[PDB]
Amino acid sequence: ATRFASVYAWNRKRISNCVADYSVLYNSASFSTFKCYGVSPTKLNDLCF
């Protein structure tokens, strides 16, 4: 996204009805911080949400 919202007006979007390869986003080597709670990002995209 080109423009990001302010923190007090944090933007929310809802995503459903699609297929996502979370490993790609994980294996992007582009993020400073990447922490998952309740789940381990390393190839646990094998579940339905």
């Binding site: 309740g38 789940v39 381990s40 390393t42 646990l44 094998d46 579940l47």
Partner: protein
């Protein structure tokens, strides 16, 4: 098992193991006491016979 890596699955499974083991010990002790009472009654019945 399907949502976490082993390092934290260890903690979670430890909690579950602790709880279930304590439940089993409670159940077994109750059964031992009840069996003692039943044996006393059975001895009385044999004596009456």
């Amino acid at each position: 098992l399907s949502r976490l890596d082993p390092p934290e699955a260890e903690v979670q499974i430890d909690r579950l193991i602790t709880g279930r083991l304590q439940s089993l010990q409670t159940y077994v002790t109750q059964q031992l006491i009840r069996a003692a009472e039943i044996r006393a009654s059975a001895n009385l019945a044999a004596t009456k016979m």
